[PDB]
């Protein structure tokens, strides 16, 4: 089977010991307390679990004898036993790609990577515990943005004059990737370094998204800032604007923000985070109680140059529900209900 | 996505070459002959298959600069092509955890491990071929015990005065681990070395188990012995008592045993095993023909310090059926039918 | 869990550093244009995708102290993000086995490997892009041959007098491997080296295949040739004959061919390929428009001793449909429809 069978094994010189095995060992003990309005549902979903996000991966680089841009590749396993999920993960569930790189133009990767929008949404703006609201939370129809996506080409510019860099990508959609649709997307992000700050902007457009009996276009825009100061304070903040249009003429808008403050002293780092989705608007009218917010607090200990321990507390207050354009409840991160969470954790890189 | 995104990669020192890749290569060619009472079912289930239980794993230890108890981790793949099952296994399907260790108090592991009761059930008392009866075999409602389980904290004491040790654990249940229930369990085991013998005891309690229209509590108790003598004989034996109670008042009891005899001489080891589940009792009344037994023989050759070859024959006589508390047949290891099996195998550890 | 639990870990000497990690990194950017007769189906299936056939594997060899034939094993992961498929692959999805070897009698492998017939069908005769027609393409009932199959024992003879070798195997079928049937197969292939040519023959017989309300027997025969000349031309050609019989008396025949021509000069290789299935015959009558063909072209650049780049164009014209013996459409590689494809790719071996 395959584009070239096992011809590589049979005929090419094996480039032996030209790989690296790496891993992130990550374990979070997390207790949740739900207030869904059904006591049974609250017992099911709540309680204590262990969220094992450990993963193994493989990567390398090769300078080919007859091609100047260095070849690069990586294959990264999924999380091995996350909470709310069964055990076991395959290779290639996370960032998994091939590509090429040259000083003058940066790097191009083909495969499964983060979109430029998602990379900023995820880090810094989803940490700590903010993701349910700011990563996949939201009430808009269509697809606000992809996150980690297969069938993607992505270019990462170099750092021009030590200050400026661009991330750009296009790819197939979730259905297209299975031969079941013609969804696609593109997007771009930029970063400007500036004394102690960095400025971020990003865009993502998603086309031919099918959902709720309709085809959608999405556009999503974002701005934010980040700073680190010599006194040990650092922070971030962002604003995120989301628009969608359906094939039947319906328009939808919703916006959001996320911010964090952090103080690093000696081997410690304290951190507070807040993020919010505001009420959604459909065809000019606001839908009441379609907003979400989350507050979070964290302390982290630099236990080894290669590792950290952390404790964290957070409160999610989610929206009270909406219908999509087919008269059915639209799934949101709030569908399972309001919940709080206490957790401790460890992360180690080899 | 995740508790900390890719922050570990981006900010921590990579602790390079601080891992080990290991594996157990294991292949059993096994021929089964079924006598289910349906000739078609006998052809399907019987015949020759290759039971590939090979697996790969990853593990290590790290002495963190600011924490005295040594960090330990492991991630172990599932069996790659076992009989009765499709090809392929993910990482984390087997014992997969993080933890910490200190000479004075032993070791604590968090993640996916064997329960203390299951560890003694499995080894020595399931070998060879005794598992259909004594591992997952049985007729009791609820859950007699978990086996390999995610969402588990487990403490392994040291060997106190060279003689005594304890294994203790608690964790979430099979439903809880998916946010679909509030099942949990706890258990403990102890071991006492004593001239040529070791004595074992263990317990497991499972709570909020849903099955058959009811919530169950289970309690399981076990006692056994193991011995090795200078003449090359060794053996084991165990007695296992299982009780369950349902939310509607029904009580169930069933007990069981397993024993093995071995003679080790030069590069060989001969082995006979026997295990049995006795007739089940429900609300004081015995249910006839709800018992199971199995007899097994084996010869094994120490073909290398790192490997063994073996041949094995066994005969399983399973129970004739029972209904659970919803008037539906209750699945047991006997539901598929009586069968015999001849096998040969190899196992290698690197 | 398992034939011998964790006994190997606990009692055998760990044969440390006695393994190899290897991979093939393989990425094909492929654009398809379908002409199915439904424009919607054409958009879904067509478009651009990235077909990531990268995989990781593990292998090794061990000279056991008390057994002369060297022990061999391998475990090979599946493709990590192929087109038309979700992300992620487990270990053991590809050639995964244990075995033994001796210079005087060759090698025996037990596990999951290619059938002797399929190996010749796949390579040389499915490259480049010929597979939809000549690999899994066809209209015959039953199973023309297995491809990569678990539950297989396979013997690879040595090269007798530097000229002659045999590949032979038997194993369980797709249903048998899950305890759901008594299907099996056997097959054999031979190769005769002869100045610049090699002659191939092969056979496969499949028994107790259930499909379309009937039990089938299949027999498949193949002859071909291959040559490499010092001037830089090489080629291959094959003829493949497929017969089937059903339990209700129906007979089916179909034949096929595949050929390729190659010119290798300096760092380049040009390649043209053609393959065809001819009209199928059932109970002596030909069924019109049940044939398939494909033409393909390719250029490949030997970019490094360990790697290649390539570009490729191909045109598949498939059959127009048939019914199986139950009055329902029989699935073929033409069911989705005629399509063309342009692709570029890279392959690297470490
Ligand atoms: Na996605
Ligand atoms: Na379980
Ligand atoms: Na098959």
Author numbering:
A (entry chain C), B (entry chain B), C (entry chain A): 1 to 350
Kindly provide excerpts from the paper associated with this entry.
The gene encoding for ChiP is found in most marine members of the Vibrionaceae, emphasizing the general importance of this OM diffusion channel for chitin utilization. The addition of micromolar concentrations of chitooligosaccharides such as chitohexaose (GlcNAc6) causes a complete block of ionic current, demonstrating tight binding. Here, we report X-ray crystal structures of VhChiP in the absence and presence of chitooligosaccharides.
We expressed VhChiP without a His-tag in the OM of the porin-deficient E. coli Bl21 omp8 strain and obtained reasonable yields (~3 mg from 12 l of culture) even though VhChiP overexpression appeared to be highly toxic for E. coli. The purified protein was crystallized in the presence of 0.4% C8E4 as detergent. The obtained crystals of VhChiP in space group C2 diffracted to reasonable resolutions of ~2.5 Å. The crystal structure of the OM-expressed channel is almost identical to that of the in vitro-folded protein. Strikingly however, in OM-expressed VhChiP the N-termini plug the pore of a neighboring β-barrel within the trimeric assembly, effectively blocking all β-barrels for substrate transport. The reason that the plug is inter- and not intra-molecular might be due to fact that the N-terminal β-strand is pointing away from its own pore towards the neighboring one. All residues of the N-terminus have good electron density in the structure and a number of polar interactions can be identified between the N-terminal plug and the barrel, most notably between Asp1 (carboxylate)-Arg94/148, Asp1 (α-amino group)-Y118/Asp122, Ala3-Glu53, Asn4-Asn127/Arg312/Glu347, Ser5-Asp122, Asp6-Arg94, and Lys9-Glu76. Thus, five out of the first six residues of the N-terminus make polar interactions with the pore of the protein, suggesting that the plug is stably inserted in the pore. As expected from the interactions observed in the crystal structure, the plug in natively expressed VhChiP is very stable with root mean square fluctuations (RMSF) of about 1.5 Å.
